[PDB]
Design an enzyme around this catalytic site. Sequence first.
Site, PDB file in Angstrom:
ATOM      1  N   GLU A  60      26.325   4.765 -11.322  1.00 34.56           N
ATOM      2  CA  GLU A  60      27.288   5.547 -10.560  1.00 34.56           C
ATOM      3  C   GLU A  60      26.929   5.626  -9.083  1.00 34.56           C
ATOM      4  O   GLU A  60      27.817   5.827  -8.251  1.00 34.56           O
ATOM      5  CB  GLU A  60      27.411   6.956 -11.140  1.00 34.56           C
ATOM      6  CG  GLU A  60      27.870   6.985 -12.580  1.00 34.56           C
ATOM      7  CD  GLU A  60      28.181   8.380 -13.072  1.00 34.56           C
ATOM      8  OE1 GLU A  60      28.017   9.331 -12.287  1.00 34.56           O
ATOM      9  OE2 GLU A  60      28.583   8.527 -14.246  1.00 34.56           O
ATOM     10  N   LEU A  73      22.491   5.666 -12.660  1.00 30.29           N
ATOM     11  CA  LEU A  73      22.175   4.776 -11.548  1.00 30.29           C
ATOM     12  C   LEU A  73      23.296   3.788 -11.277  1.00 30.29           C
ATOM     13  O   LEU A  73      23.427   3.289 -10.154  1.00 30.29           O
ATOM     14  CB  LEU A  73      20.868   4.038 -11.823  1.00 30.29           C
ATOM     15  CG  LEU A  73      19.573   4.658 -11.301  1.00 30.29           C
ATOM     16  CD1 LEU A  73      19.250   5.992 -11.921  1.00 30.29           C
ATOM     17  CD2 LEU A  73      18.442   3.687 -11.561  1.00 30.29           C
ATOM     18  N   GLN A 102       1.018   4.252  -3.094  1.00 29.37           N
ATOM     19  CA  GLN A 102       0.703   5.631  -2.742  1.00 29.37           C
ATOM     20  C   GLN A 102       1.901   6.553  -2.923  1.00 29.37           C
ATOM     21  O   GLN A 102       1.721   7.754  -3.148  1.00 29.37           O
ATOM     22  CB  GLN A 102       0.188   5.695  -1.310  1.00 29.37           C
ATOM     23  CG  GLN A 102      -1.162   5.043  -1.134  1.00 29.37           C
ATOM     24  CD  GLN A 102      -1.597   4.995   0.306  1.00 29.37           C
ATOM     25  OE1 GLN A 102      -0.867   5.417   1.200  1.00 29.37           O
ATOM     26  NE2 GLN A 102      -2.785   4.460   0.547  1.00 29.37           N
ATOM     27  N   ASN A 131       4.348  11.754   0.744  1.00 27.67           N
ATOM     28  CA  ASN A 131       4.733  11.133  -0.510  1.00 27.67           C
ATOM     29  C   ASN A 131       5.200  12.152  -1.537  1.00 27.67           C
ATOM     30  O   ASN A 131       5.837  11.767  -2.522  1.00 27.67           O
ATOM     31  CB  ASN A 131       3.567  10.319  -1.061  1.00 27.67           C
ATOM     32  CG  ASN A 131       3.191   9.173  -0.149  1.00 27.67           C
ATOM     33  OD1 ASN A 131       4.051   8.513   0.428  1.00 27.67           O
ATOM     34  ND2 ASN A 131       1.896   8.942   0.001  1.00 27.67           N
ATOM     35  N   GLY A 142       4.492  -3.342   6.150  1.00 26.23           N
ATOM     36  CA  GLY A 142       3.381  -4.150   5.693  1.00 26.23           C
ATOM     37  C   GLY A 142       3.816  -5.527   5.231  1.00 26.23           C
ATOM     38  O   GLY A 142       4.989  -5.785   4.982  1.00 26.23           O
ATOM     39  N   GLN A 161       0.823  -1.201   0.000  1.00 25.88           N
ATOM     40  CA  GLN A 161       0.000   0.000   0.000  1.00 25.88           C
ATOM     41  C   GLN A 161       0.859   1.253   0.000  1.00 25.88           C
ATOM     42  O   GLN A 161       0.496   2.255  -0.627  1.00 25.88           O
ATOM     43  CB  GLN A 161      -0.936   0.001   1.205  1.00 25.88           C
ATOM     44  CG  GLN A 161      -1.916   1.151   1.204  1.00 25.88           C
ATOM     45  CD  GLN A 161      -2.852   1.114   2.374  1.00 25.88           C
ATOM     46  OE1 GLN A 161      -2.745   0.250   3.243  1.00 25.88           O
ATOM     47  NE2 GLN A 161      -3.789   2.050   2.404  1.00 25.88           N
TER      48      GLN A 161
HETATM   49  N1  LIG Z   1       5.781   7.451   3.438  1.00 27.12           N
HETATM   50  C1  LIG Z   1       4.607   6.841   3.342  1.00 27.12           C
HETATM   51  N2  LIG Z   1       4.398   5.654   4.006  1.00 27.12           N
HETATM   52  C2  LIG Z   1       3.208   5.024   3.914  1.00 27.12           C
HETATM   53  C3  LIG Z   1       2.189   5.562   3.159  1.00 27.12           C
HETATM   54  N3  LIG Z   1       1.132   4.733   3.249  1.00 27.12           N
HETATM   55  C4  LIG Z   1       1.462   3.687   4.039  1.00 27.12           C
HETATM   56  N4  LIG Z   1       2.743   3.867   4.468  1.00 27.12           N
HETATM   57  C5  LIG Z   1       3.529   2.971   5.325  1.00 27.12           C
HETATM   58  O1  LIG Z   1       3.185   1.627   5.060  1.00 27.12           O
HETATM   59  C6  LIG Z   1       3.393   0.869   6.228  1.00 27.12           C
HETATM   60  C7  LIG Z   1       2.477  -0.341   6.252  1.00 27.12           C
HETATM   61  O2  LIG Z   1       2.623  -1.043   5.042  1.00 27.12           O
HETATM   62  P1  LIG Z   1       1.469  -1.001   3.930  1.00 27.12           P
HETATM   63  O3  LIG Z   1       2.019  -0.517   2.614  1.00 27.12           O
HETATM   64  O4  LIG Z   1       0.334  -0.122   4.391  1.00 27.12           O
HETATM   65  O5  LIG Z   1       0.949  -2.519   3.845  1.00 27.12           O
HETATM   66  P2  LIG Z   1       1.460  -3.480   2.668  1.00 27.12           P
HETATM   67  O6  LIG Z   1       2.911  -3.233   2.347  1.00 27.12           O
HETATM   68  O7  LIG Z   1       0.564  -3.291   1.472  1.00 27.12           O
HETATM   69  O8  LIG Z   1       1.279  -4.958   3.260  1.00 27.12           O
HETATM   70  P3  LIG Z   1      -0.169  -5.378   3.797  1.00 27.12           P
HETATM   71  O9  LIG Z   1      -0.212  -5.101   5.276  1.00 27.12           O
HETATM   72  O10 LIG Z   1      -0.384  -6.850   3.548  1.00 27.12           O
HETATM   73  O11 LIG Z   1      -1.219  -4.555   3.091  1.00 27.12           O
HETATM   74  C8  LIG Z   1       3.120   1.815   7.376  1.00 27.12           C
HETATM   75  O12 LIG Z   1       4.082   1.624   8.382  1.00 27.12           O
HETATM   76  C9  LIG Z   1       3.267   3.202   6.799  1.00 27.12           C
HETATM   77  O13 LIG Z   1       4.384   3.826   7.376  1.00 27.12           O
HETATM   78  C10 LIG Z   1       2.395   6.757   2.489  1.00 27.12           C
HETATM   79  O14 LIG Z   1       1.501   7.252   1.812  1.00 27.12           O
HETATM   80  N5  LIG Z   1       3.604   7.397   2.580  1.00 27.12           N
HETATM   81  N1  LIG Z   2      36.419  20.736 -15.479  1.00 26.10           N
HETATM   82  C1  LIG Z   2      35.233  20.095 -15.559  1.00 26.10           C
HETATM   83  N2  LIG Z   2      35.085  18.944 -14.869  1.00 26.10           N
HETATM   84  C2  LIG Z   2      33.922  18.265 -14.904  1.00 26.10           C
HETATM   85  C3  LIG Z   2      32.821  18.779 -15.711  1.00 26.10           C
HETATM   86  N3  LIG Z   2      31.806  17.914 -15.571  1.00 26.10           N
HETATM   87  C4  LIG Z   2      32.232  16.925 -14.746  1.00 26.10           C
HETATM   88  N4  LIG Z   2      33.492  17.145 -14.351  1.00 26.10           N
HETATM   89  C5  LIG Z   2      34.309  16.291 -13.473  1.00 26.10           C
HETATM   90  O1  LIG Z   2      34.166  14.940 -13.892  1.00 26.10           O
HETATM   91  C6  LIG Z   2      34.115  14.075 -12.766  1.00 26.10           C
HETATM   92  C7  LIG Z   2      32.970  13.110 -12.997  1.00 26.10           C
HETATM   93  O2  LIG Z   2      33.272  12.344 -14.153  1.00 26.10           O
HETATM   94  P1  LIG Z   2      32.111  12.008 -15.203  1.00 26.10           P
HETATM   95  O3  LIG Z   2      32.632  12.022 -16.615  1.00 26.10           O
HETATM   96  O4  LIG Z   2      30.963  12.972 -15.041  1.00 26.10           O
HETATM   97  O5  LIG Z   2      31.683  10.523 -14.774  1.00 26.10           O
HETATM   98  P2  LIG Z   2      31.844   9.329 -15.826  1.00 26.10           P
HETATM   99  O6  LIG Z   2      30.999   9.618 -17.041  1.00 26.10           O
HETATM  100  O7  LIG Z   2      31.385   8.045 -15.184  1.00 26.10           O
HETATM  101  O8  LIG Z   2      33.296   9.200 -16.204  1.00 26.10           O
HETATM  102  C8  LIG Z   2      33.877  14.937 -11.546  1.00 26.10           C
HETATM  103  O9  LIG Z   2      34.967  14.769 -10.642  1.00 26.10           O
HETATM  104  C9  LIG Z   2      33.854  16.365 -12.036  1.00 26.10           C
HETATM  105  O10 LIG Z   2      34.797  17.131 -11.293  1.00 26.10           O
HETATM  106  C10 LIG Z   2      33.061  20.040 -16.435  1.00 26.10           C
HETATM  107  O11 LIG Z   2      32.175  20.549 -17.142  1.00 26.10           O
HETATM  108  N5  LIG Z   2      34.255  20.621 -16.311  1.00 26.10           N
HETATM  109 MG   LIG Z   3      -0.801  -2.517   2.603  1.00 23.42          MG
END
Ligand SMILES: Nc1nc2c(ncn2[C@@H]2O[C@H](COP(=O)(O)OP(=O)(O)OP(=O)(O)O)[C@@H](O)[C@H]2O)c(=O)[nH]1
Ligand SMILES: Nc1nc2c(ncn2[C@@H]2O[C@H](COP(=O)(O)OP(=O)(O)O)[C@@H](O)[C@H]2O)c(=O)[nH]1
Ligand SMILES: [Mg+2]
Lengths: 429, 429, 437, 437
Positions: C250, C248, C15, C224, C139, C11
């Site tokens: 990195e 991601l 949300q 949220n 949950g 849940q």
């Molecule tokens: N940050 C955030 N946490 C939420 C929200 N809604 C529910 N929760 C969290 O969800 C936890 C409970 O898990 P749920 O997602 O409600 O239940 P579930 O994962 O679906 O598992 P079931 O109990 O089987 O339904 C609670 O501890 C809440 O903290 C939300 O809108 N925002």
């Molecule tokens: N001088 C300079 N350095 C940069 C710039 N952009 C990123 N960097 C440097 O590049 C490094 C990150 O490397 P990056 O090429 O972005 O990551 P990679 O693609 O995984 O190799 C960081 O330490 C930054 O300091 C820029 O425009 N100028």
């Molecule tokens: Mg739930």
Amino acid sequence: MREIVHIQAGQCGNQIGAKFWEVISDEHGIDPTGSYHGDSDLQLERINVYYNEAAGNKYVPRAILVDLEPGTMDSVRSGPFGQIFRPDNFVFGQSGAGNNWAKGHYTEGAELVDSVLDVVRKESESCDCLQGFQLTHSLGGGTGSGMGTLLISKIREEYPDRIMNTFSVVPSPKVSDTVVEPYNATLSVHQLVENTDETYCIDNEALYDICFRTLKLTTPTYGDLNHLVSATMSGVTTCLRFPGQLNADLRKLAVNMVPFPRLHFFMPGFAPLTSRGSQQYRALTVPELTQQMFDAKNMMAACDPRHGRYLTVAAVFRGRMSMKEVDEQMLNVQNKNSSYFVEWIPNNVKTAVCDIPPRGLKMSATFIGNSTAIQELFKRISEQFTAMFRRKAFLHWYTGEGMDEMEFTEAESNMNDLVSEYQQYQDAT
Amino acid sequence: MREIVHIQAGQCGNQIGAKFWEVISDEHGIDPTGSYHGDSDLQLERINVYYNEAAGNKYVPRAILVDLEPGTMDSVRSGPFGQIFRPDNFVFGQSGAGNNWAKGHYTEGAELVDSVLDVVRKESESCDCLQGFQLTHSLGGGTGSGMGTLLISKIREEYPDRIMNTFSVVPSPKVSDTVVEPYNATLSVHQLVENTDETYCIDNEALYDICFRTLKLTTPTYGDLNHLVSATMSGVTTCLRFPGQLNADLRKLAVNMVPFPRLHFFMPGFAPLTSRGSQQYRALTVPELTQQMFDAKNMMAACDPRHGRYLTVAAVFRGRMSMKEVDEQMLNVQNKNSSYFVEWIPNNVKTAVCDIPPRGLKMSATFIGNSTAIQELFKRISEQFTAMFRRKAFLHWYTGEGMDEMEFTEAESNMNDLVSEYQQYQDAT
Amino acid sequence: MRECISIHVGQAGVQIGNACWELYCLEHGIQPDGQMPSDGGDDSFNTFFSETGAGKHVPRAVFVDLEPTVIDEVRTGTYRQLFHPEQLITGKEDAANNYARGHYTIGKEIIDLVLDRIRKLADQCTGLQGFLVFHSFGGGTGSGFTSLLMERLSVDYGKKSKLEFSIYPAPQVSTAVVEPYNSILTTHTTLEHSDCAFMVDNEAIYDICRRNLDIERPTYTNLNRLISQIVSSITASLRFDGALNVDLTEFQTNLVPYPRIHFPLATYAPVISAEKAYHEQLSVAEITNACFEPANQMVKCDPRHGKYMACCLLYRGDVVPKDVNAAIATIKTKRSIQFVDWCPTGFKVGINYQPPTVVPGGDLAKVQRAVCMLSNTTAIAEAWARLDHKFDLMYAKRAFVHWYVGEGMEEGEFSEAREDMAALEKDYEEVGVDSVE
Amino acid sequence: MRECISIHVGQAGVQIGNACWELYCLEHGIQPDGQMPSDGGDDSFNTFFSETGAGKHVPRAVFVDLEPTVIDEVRTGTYRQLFHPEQLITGKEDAANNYARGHYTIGKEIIDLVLDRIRKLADQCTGLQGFLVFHSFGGGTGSGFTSLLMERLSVDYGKKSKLEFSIYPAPQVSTAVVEPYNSILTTHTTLEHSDCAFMVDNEAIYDICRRNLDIERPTYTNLNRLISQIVSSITASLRFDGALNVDLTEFQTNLVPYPRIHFPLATYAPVISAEKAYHEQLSVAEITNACFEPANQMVKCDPRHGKYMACCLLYRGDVVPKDVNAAIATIKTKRSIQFVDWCPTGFKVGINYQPPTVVPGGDLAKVQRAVCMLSNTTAIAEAWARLDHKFDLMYAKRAFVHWYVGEGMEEGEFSEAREDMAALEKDYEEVGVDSVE
Ligand SMILES: Nc1nc2c(ncn2[C@@H]2O[C@H](COP(=O)(O)OP(=O)(O)OP(=O)(O)O)[C@@H](O)[C@H]2O)c(=O)[nH]1
Ligand SMILES: Nc1nc2c(ncn2[C@@H]2O[C@H](COP(=O)(O)OP(=O)(O)O)[C@@H](O)[C@H]2O)c(=O)[nH]1
Ligand SMILES: [Mg+2]
Ligand SMILES: Nc1nc2c(ncn2[C@@H]2O[C@H](COP(=O)(O)OP(=O)(O)OP(=O)(O)O)[C@@H](O)[C@H]2O)c(=O)[nH]1
Ligand SMILES: Nc1nc2c(ncn2[C@@H]2O[C@H](COP(=O)(O)OP(=O)(O)O)[C@@H](O)[C@H]2O)c(=O)[nH]1
Ligand SMILES: [Mg+2]
């Protein structure tokens, strides 16, 4: 002739290079389309080094833009000067390095590098007489440290005689931009000392000062930092692209600046660097350009040269100037700083003068410094490396990608086989 | 050649100097922008002593404006003739001296002085052949007494041969402008007697009289007082900047006026000084200019010369005049005042004639007087010092900033090692 | 072309995604119908919106629940027209705060339906990077079904960057009684599978929504929104071109030093109301000190009681990289922010050119810059020490165990999950100490 | 760029700042909205107005009270739109004429909230000089919370120029009963912390507003205008370029001969009504004799019963520095103005080019020049001799001590504060005598 194939790795090397090809296309009068629109044939005299002439009197940049994610390239190919590159050259993967060296050098780098070298070999055979390959990457990233140092190991095997100058953005002393950048640097310096003829250490911390202190930029974006790196990059090969009263090239800067083949880690410098208002309150003379270079606050590698000795020094000048006015100032900074220069290299200043100034400038310089001041660049990183490695932190994001600890035992010792050599040739009588 | 680097400390030295560079820019025909707009090349003949020629035929003043708070500089940089200085030269702190010598010489002075000397050393190497440094500051303030006397101790170590003339606004006899100005003076005279080749004692009480009595100014602002100090300041170096029939400079005025190296505390004087209406009712002759100088009511240091003996006397004249008409009057005031001049220096009058008058004047003078009349200048301050110090009043605003009482035991004894020397060479047979 | 699909379990996870996919439609100009008016994007939507044949974009989301009611409000809500109805997966009965019903009894029913809907999405992805599993630790569905699902995705993919955004149970706020059971059990399983699970707590957003937003009465609508601004700013570098992008792949590289320790706590800034959008200037130095301030984090932990292992400042909007270094180099000098001895490089920095947009009906203010700190710290060992202590009190009396043994689970499996959690607890003690010599 | 933040403690300190920040908005053309019409300033506002992202300037003020009512009138007044609402700090219950409640019981609650709001302002200050603490010696907040706060700022900063503007208790006018307790206790603490605390008395402004302004019925609206003209004229040299500027570091240097003695009494001139803005010419010689006249000072002390140690004439407006020397050299010749034997240089002179402006709805007249005398004199020993005598009568019967012991304070601590005040009392006797030989 003497053509140069430009290779870009990482997000950083693309953002430098997209600004770098903005400078080259302005120095050669090239439009956003790819056509020549300058004024003189001196722009077209050595147009062929960075450009292949396409049909219809259009020029494509001899550039190979490499990434592992399409996020950087789509910013490049859709922005300004993005319709000038060939769509063949944009060789990018999909998975991304993940800010990881091992994913950039073993896993996702090796699954793309054969589609990169076939674009290299296509451009290398399109060259008349190849001068060598320039590379723009970082040492803190995952792609530019991984894919970049994988490209150098493939190229030096395939082109052992050509010069391999890399523009490595070495990480900053104060801040980090990556938690594992002591790992990405040390595993790349393992690959830079054996396969590059020279390497230009640039720090983002030092360019943060030069924008604020020297140029008075309160809000410098990366588009303002990269115009300072590209000012060095076009200033290194400006005597190869233009006639000068004393022409240098990438082999003169290789021979004169590398006394020992490992010790090819340079710091750059540029002059003049002025503010908006403070440029009409200053006389642009060769003694003004000379003393602006050799101070601490104009080194793009974040280290004071006063902590070490300059081994060798190159000062590539642009614009019309007189040679005695140069050669006195190259002597004048050597008399007063005789302890600051190394002793057993007498007259350690290389001079180059180009006749073509940058666009909007009367005269300009390009400092190349090979010092023992960057032994502290590796005293800092190898201390940051060993503090992380003795706890084996973040090791499983590398060991899980095909790596052992013996890779780190060698790469740390290889860097300390370089720290001890700058200490050897700073203590040398 | 013989270039002079102008240094300004304190609020006072900036307000004098901003009026001083108003006079120099009018004597050389310099616009508010920085460009030459005079009539003859004699303004451009020795333009280089106070000016560096920038690009575009513009001239920046060779001036280094130092403060510890931005309140004075923003009045300078935004007023008239504020767009002419380089923005690099304005080296100011943020904390302010707080009208304190110890905060100006130890705490906030030392945290700025390395960023001042690097602007000094930048301007000193821009000089062709350096003549020496002139300084404008006070002895009652905190910055001009603290930061100024910290600059002299750094410069005389770095430039031992160059002349160091300071224009010290010595505090007034009747009124004070500072409660702790007997402390700020005595701690500065400790630093002036060992590191300055000469020093021009000026009192604000005496300029209050000369504006009211001599010029008939009912409402004299500081902009009217500083035009009288700057009239002396441009009048001292007017033979160095212009041809004359008998040229002097800052070393002729050093050698001829300092018989003993401590006794370099001078009183200035200027002539003619007329009212608005009362200037057409007066014949401007050299005998008129001569007798206007040597009386009591035209001494910018508030002391009557009749209480002492003139050791040495310089009379730098401006405008076209005849030398016998000068040399009779330099003799004529020595015959009638033979007791008022010192006896064991026969013919103690230095003469200098410049050919260029001030703007709007037919002829002009500049009196320099080295007398034993300023032993009462230090009889008054050392009495005001000892009355405050024997109760140790305001001591904790100095002891809390890194100072002991031994600093005051020496500085008071150093001044009484100077009061006893003027008494020695007034009693000398 | 760097596609990234997202899964929404429980849940809580649905949300959260109702606010996340609300936010993504506003960042790309997408209507709830999918028909975005194309009357500047340029394949920005591609990482989440596989395009249909018409001018309609549908999301790469798999909304799964074992009970239909939270899915049916999506099916009748504003975003009825947006989602592919085969993606909206329902069971019949919920796991109902039972990990064993989410992992053995009910979860095994529709797990092949969910893996089918993933594999239909994963085949039309050409550059698929990783997963965004939204669930809760409390949950039964968000614990049981996620742990069943993360078993299956690591079997089928393995090398993909599987990221979680978990609702960690608060120390004193617990809306369920067996949260100390469902959280220990789901972490024993997701440890060897999830690449980097982002902890989020409710109580630390109850702190922020009351203090920083000046809302007297924050709703799960509002909590949220703040989690949606986190997940948008992580995937802002994929969707938008930045001055320094970050993939991601990195994040798991820069933040995970050891394969056990992959639990960072997120932190967003600026969180200010509309009246306080004025009265401050919000530099990148101002919004960076807000993240390392212990009151403004989104997991109830004291970072001064531990050490940061790896921080990750994800700037976006009007951000200048020089002032970034001005903001970060000061913080390593401050004593309250301390790192571990082995980590001199304790930062990963990302900058996007796009500002965060504000959702209409939202409570945050329109700001020109933001930061999503993702800081892996030692201070989460205080959180797991509480949760084992809540586990050890309940399990020593064997409370609630018959609701789990009777659903297929071994009683001795709780001894496996607790001793493994104790083995994770000493890891932060093993990493948190310095190095000899 | 010479920034100076200000703190406002107690009911008195907030109501003073309601007139001070009213005055500063008129000197810079600032509306109560913060939107100054920029249709001549040139970074004049920078020492008090940190600029926001819009065309809105917000003040560097921390309005703190333990009771909400005096803050809530600011929150509903004309300057609602001006102040940052996080700066407007309220407690729940006031200290309520209890030093121990301001220093131990209630003041310890929000002291970390106030030090947080200072440190947020102190980080965006680039050239921060010092502090302007506005409080009173009578109330429990202005005595207790200030003394708690000045303990903390000297720990955190130390070297900054911490200035106070205190409402000293009048000899015969006392609106509280335990003013002899709150004044002795707050001075024992602020002695080793405050750099130069400016004394201001109500009764001596009751004298001036009745006599010099010809107001039959002066209000606390009107008494706070005269204190605002003092603090504006001290910070007029920072905000505006003058013919002879003076920094806050210069005041503590020129006026404080000994670290104990740092209690000058302010004096403003000309204080004349609108009908008497004519009928006199107001030279700088005329307005200087008004300050040294004993009837026109703003602390009820007789300067003819003591000696001036250091005077500080802060001229502003149409002031000519030659006639300044004409005004000052005559006063050292007059016998009624006498200095101490060790001080021949008993003056610090400042001149600003800006005249004081008049607030609409104000009672002062538009004058082209003014003077804020800050004179440290021996005549304040008569003030402390009264206040110990008011202390010694109450404490000998142990009156009101149970309201202070029951809030965490030692009974023997009153013996510490009184004997320390007796040690301060002999200091003016030690300094006020001449020197032997
Ligand atoms: N940050 C955030 N946490 C939420 C929200 N809604 C529910 N929760 C969290 O969800 C936890 C409970 O898990 P749920 O997602 O409600 O239940 P579930 O994962 O679906 O598992 P079931 O109990 O089987 O339904 C609670 O501890 C809440 O903290 C939300 O809108 N925002
Ligand atoms: N001088 C300079 N350095 C940069 C710039 N952009 C990123 N960097 C440097 O590049 C490094 C990150 O490397 P990056 O090429 O972005 O990551 P990679 O693609 O995984 O190799 C960081 O330490 C930054 O300091 C820029 O425009 N100028
Ligand atoms: Mg739930
Ligand atoms: N000059 C001046 N003094 C004021 C004003 N308002 C109150 N006071 C003084 O404040 C003193 C009492 O202190 P308060 O500020 O009212 O009380 P407090 O400091 O908030 O401490 P609490 O009693 O706990 O509220 C009285 O002696 C008054 O002289 C004012 O507007 N102007
Ligand atoms: N002649 C002259 N003296 C000034 C002027 N302004 C200030 N002063 C003197 O300078 C002294 C104060 O020094 P100041 O520079 O303002 O303080 P500081 O900045 O801390 O050194 C006072 O004694 C004034 O007499 C001016 O314009 N002309
Ligand atoms: Mg009150």
